[PDB]
DNA sequence: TTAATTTATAAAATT
DNA sequence: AAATTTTATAAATTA
DNA sequence: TAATTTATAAAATT
DNA sequence: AAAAATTTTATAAAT
């Protein structure tokens, strides 16, 4: 603005200068777009912007603290150009924020949890699989989306709303509501996916298996109102804080790893989150652009697999279909190496899976060889009958 | 050619379209190079090709077998077909290995074998940081560069070849030797840097420590003709393949991973490998493209940074001066951070680093913010005096 | 020296 | 009909 | 019994 | 410098 260049002279030269170039990239830039003011500097074209350009992308910071300055530097809500601040902070920890370091300690227990033979723990719960699953979940869910307990609590299945876009190549499960996260399948890496674990112990938690443990029966999704992701003793409720907080420990030790519960009962900040904003598109989801979401769940986005076979019923109210149609491409692509690995394992048990083609399948074609899954074998403390 | 086109009706129609395709679309893409038969088909330009295109690069495999087939398909002689092919599929391990799996073993392992305090091990061995600094060096050396131990034995430093490239911004440790490699440091993770741990490790091999033990003296790189890149019992040479497999086992049961000896001490081909080969460029560094080296040290390439702090001698012949000169910037770049991680190491004990200077930086600003370090940490299994 | 908080123990209530 | 999430409550962590 | 890993007995250097 | 100790060499045991 002819109003604008004047308050650049009350900044240090060399800072000023730089604003003055940033400033001329992102307007040049911006010129790339369909449509004087303000609305000019909006969360959404600084965020394309940066993530947009490599060159920016390594180095967010001066065009953050820039687009701040420019923000406050005309007429804006103080609140409003810090709420921005905020996303733009948030924006960089997920870009620079490098998972390499973290990713060890959701592989060591993830698979120390699939693994239904552990001797080494006496504890009462996780007698089941089942039980293990439910923890499993929970955590593997706090790791990928970075969300809060009690909002993890909060969160109703029926809310959920299933991304499949075919068109874009594109599957998940995402949540518009309080909670605002959204979660993708990683089909290179089933144990350390968050929703082949819930594929699993949801085919637990409602088909049960036969002559063993009793399911809950998909029926009652339609006479309750709330959902609860994981269930506690009730059918209607999530589990209670301390129990978990009882059950956290208890495997951390197990599998050796020093154990902090902030960390997981409660956002972790040092960690990268999804916005907050108050059915997708190519590049975002549900508000949400897909850098963010492939980020944090730390794999490429897909297409959903189209498999033949359903574990899961194909009759249901048309709202959580699409869900447990998501949950049965998952659970049916991946139960093959799940199979090879830990035979032993609960789901194996129903006799659903032990008919002649479903013994088929399970011993067809692999979906990723094994000697991919060597090294997170390694990092278990109980070796099964199998070992490789 | 005029008297191909006759034996691509040899074949299934569909299988022998797909060729033509492949074909097509080679050729039309080497108009793009300078410069009548077989030479055309060179494993230089089937590898730029395939690597240079992410379509297929994704999906090398109907390239790779289509061009086997062109070649023996044509007259080339037999074992050289078959060394294509040998190239070819070491190329398809390499791009579509996942080493998101492998990872935590290395990680695990070299964090534990830094630090200066094991309360969990009793064994004589590694007593010294020096020792444990020396396997840890073999271990992160094979993992990074995937060689024989013998071969491991056969290479003289002398041999190698300090690659500075600041006009690409690349820096390194090359060997176009028998063994054929190329090392890079990791300095967002120098722990996990071989070349880190092979800078202190010199230091402490060749400088010494003060008070303590000798040092072995800077004079003897030239009066020796092979200087092993480890020293055994004997200066002149590599320590015996039956110590070295003593070490490891001990080191792997502290750890608490499974060992498997044939996969540090034979090549492991579930594993990638470098190209043989019977003073680099933009894509390429001795014989070798980037992205071999940068998926298989899995760090991006990145310029020498100049430190003006020299731990190393800068009076040397001017042939292993280069290659100290990287140590040193590896060294002097990550040096505050192992202090301020483990104080305790062997490395502080000298004078040299007690200077008013020494301590002036080593307590100075750090490369990289610890909070990026938590979760290396989290895996060992003595948590030293200090904590986070 | 109050708080506010993660752990560690004792009857109870349900699945 | 057993057994453990659930309350409940205090002890031991801190700030 | 291949062989490939592991433990034990005199020895030789650092 | 002389004397401690573990890589060494070998050699047998065992997987």
Redesign the pocket.
């Known amino acids: 603005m002819s109003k604008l260049d004047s308050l650049l002279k009350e900044l240090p030269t060399r800072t000023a200068h730089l604003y003055r170039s940033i400033w001329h990239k992102y307007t040049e830039w911006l010129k790339t777009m369909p449509d004087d003011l303000k609305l000019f500097l909006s969360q959404k074209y600084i965020v394309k912007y940066i993530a947009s350009h490599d060159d920016i992308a390594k180095d967010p910071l001066p065009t953050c603290d820039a687009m701040i300055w420019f923000s406050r530097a005309l007429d804006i809500e103080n609140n409003d150009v810090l709420v921005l601040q905020q996303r733009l902070y948030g924006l960089v920890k997920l870009l620079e924020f490098d998972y390499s370091n973290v990713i060890a300690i959701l592989q060591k227990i993830s698979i120390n949890l699939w693994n239904p033979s552990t001797d080494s723990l006496q504890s009462?719960?996780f007698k089941t699989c089942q039980d293990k699953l439910k923890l499993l979940l929970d955590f593997q869910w706090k790791f990928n989306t970075n969300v809060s307990f009690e909002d993890r609590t909060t969160v109703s299945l029926k809310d959920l709303q299933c991304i499949l876009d075919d068109e874009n190549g594109k599957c998940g499960l995402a949540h518009s509501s309080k909670p605002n996260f959204v979660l993708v399948p990683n089909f290179q890496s089933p144990f350390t996916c968050p929703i082949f674990t819930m594929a699993v112990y949801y085919y637990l938690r409602f088909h049960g298996v036969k002559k063993y443990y009793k399911g809950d029966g998909y029926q009652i999704l339609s006479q309750l109102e709330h959902i609860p992701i994981i269930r506690?003793?009730?059918?209607d409720?999530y589990?209670?804080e301390?129990?978990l907080?009882?059950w956290y420990?208890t495997i951390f030790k197990y599998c050796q790893l020093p154990?902090t519960?902030?960390h997981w009962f409660q956002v972790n900040q040092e960690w990268p989150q999804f916005p907050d904003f108050s059915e997708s598109d190519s590049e975002n989801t549900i508000g949400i652009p897909d850098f963010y979401i492939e980020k944090m769940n730390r794999t490429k986005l897909q297409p959903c697999p189209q498999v033949h076979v359903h574990l899961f019923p194909t009759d249901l109210p048309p709202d959580i279909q699409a869900v447990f149609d998501l949950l049965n491409s998952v659970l049916v692509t991946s139960l093959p190496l799940l199979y090879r690995v830990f035979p032993t394992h609960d789901i194996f048990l129903d006799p659903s899976l032990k008919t002649p083609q479903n013994i088929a399948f399970l011993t067809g074609t692999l979906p990723l060889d094994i000697e991919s899954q060597e090294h997170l074998l390694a990092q278990l403390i109980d070796k099964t009958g199998t070992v490789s």
Not at 232 to 235: H, N, P
């Open positions: 009462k719960h506690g003793k009730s059918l409720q589990p209670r301390l129990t907080g009882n420990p154990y519960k902030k």
